[PDB]
Amino acid sequence: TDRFTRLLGIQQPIIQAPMLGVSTPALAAAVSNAGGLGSIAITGSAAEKGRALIREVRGLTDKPFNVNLFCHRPGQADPARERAWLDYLKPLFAEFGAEPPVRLKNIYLSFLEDPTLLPMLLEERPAAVSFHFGAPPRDQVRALQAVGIRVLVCATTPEEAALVEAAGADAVVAQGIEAGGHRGVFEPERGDAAIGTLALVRLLAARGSLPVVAAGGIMDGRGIRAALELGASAVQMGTAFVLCPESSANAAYREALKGPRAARTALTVTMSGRSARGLPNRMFFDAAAPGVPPLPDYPFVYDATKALQTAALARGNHDFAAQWAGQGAALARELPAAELLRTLVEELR
């Protein structure tokens, strides 16, 4: 199908997934120059810094690229809950001769609570703007579209996909249970249908009319071929690009992904406050276990964890790192992004 590639003015139906902390302008430009759609994530950063990152990408590529923003429900501070969480983490900090932070901060501002992001986006005009955890109001999506920007939203169910349609997006990113990183569920408090890529992509393509981008578990040309047979118009690959040299994955992350840990992934809500999939470690614990206090809101939880990670890292310890990977992780390859992009295009045939 030409549906997606024509929609975004690119050659290849391949998006390199925006991965906050792992994607980079070098990674994005590499994929975009190679004919796909490279991406960056700019949540957690001030608008002008977002604006700089976009321009960094432009200085590397003249081809379309994707800019991703978190659109979650703005986190609700709860100092009592947050204090009880910190006290619970106290022995972990003490292990590295450290103390937990005194307070926690809303480190990731939602697109719905930072008014300055939309106007900056309407100025920079990246070819694509994608959202995770929810959809903006239709008039906001329309404003970006009015300026030539394609709008992507991640959905995890047919019900969420309907909301993406109502928001007026140009394409839906259909994220199956296989996907590495944070799950795109809109309202985790209602539960999580946890639908696999194969079913979700088929359900959205066969019973919907929006171009579908399949995300989760896709690691090669056979996977891409399979996604297209299901009716997707393109794929989004995260894990597959992590070992690329252009990525900002650290040493230990690359080692975990290259090694035997890659055979088994798991979901955690205790790392960030929102369900996410990666290589299990000490930050993957049972929040339902005895003596574990109620969980603070996302993203305050991640703030607490990031403080612990820093303390851990200050003693050579990476057992608390966020090493996100999808269920196809064992098929991970290590190539320069543009060479990987083209290997995929070849395997895609």
Added chain:
Amino acid sequence: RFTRLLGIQQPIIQAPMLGVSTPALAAAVSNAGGLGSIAITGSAAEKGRALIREVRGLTDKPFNVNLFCHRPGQADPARERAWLDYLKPLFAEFGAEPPVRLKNIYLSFLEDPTLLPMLLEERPAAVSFHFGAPPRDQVRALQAVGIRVLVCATTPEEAALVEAAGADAVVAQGIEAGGHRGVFEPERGDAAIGTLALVRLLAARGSLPVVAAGGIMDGRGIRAALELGASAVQMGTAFVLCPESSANAAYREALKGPRAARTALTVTMSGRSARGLPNRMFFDAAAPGVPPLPDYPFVYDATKALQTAALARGNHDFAAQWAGQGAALARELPAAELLRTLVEEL
């Protein structure tokens, strides 16, 4: 390919489905060119033999006979007595009271020695195993006669154990699948891998023909699995609405209707994780007030007692209505006609 490995013309297996599959359904699929299947667990061996003879009465073509190979359930009177006490108000609602004791109503292939020699005589083209792999010993014993041996796995780790046991094929069950999850050891957790990842993994780093199971509802779904490296396909939910199936009317209406839009996993129906259309038997076993679960299949024994009492009042809110995550794509056709349509779409 796999289609040569078994005596068949089409690479589509109609999943064996305890209480849903019938000799009539199996025969219709086998006569149409695929591999029809029945489930034999929970029947004494001479009763399972009778069922196999029923299928032979309707088709000369190959079929599949399925047996549970789970870690045999272990009785805990204290835990079971507390479970039934917790269910007591549900029973009471339909004028019943919980059964005295619970029973091991489904004997694993590991604890009933009379199943293997029956299978040796009857010699169906295919014998499949769910929840675990039997000793390579016995797989060879079946393979010595005409039999191709299939075992379901939910992870590459389980697939390796399948390979070790000398099976002719591994059924790769993704998270999408309806009914009981084939996880060998659930108390060790459950990786809950999706079909798309699982098939690719097993086809990329495995040696056995892999049969994709979970979420496939049409020819595009079959083509996708084949692109992933599958040699064939196993489909349960797609066949439930076939008039030949053993699905009762309430079940058929549920799957045809809006409830098909959402499935979920429950361990409280049977004591082992299973995917279906949620109802009053889908509750939170971690919830305050809910006691430790008995082993599988003792829990299902209790549930069935409750299902009887609910049915006698015309209440279907406790039924076992299994369905995979592709449930909303279900179609209602004669089984042979569905297989023909699938083949055309493929």
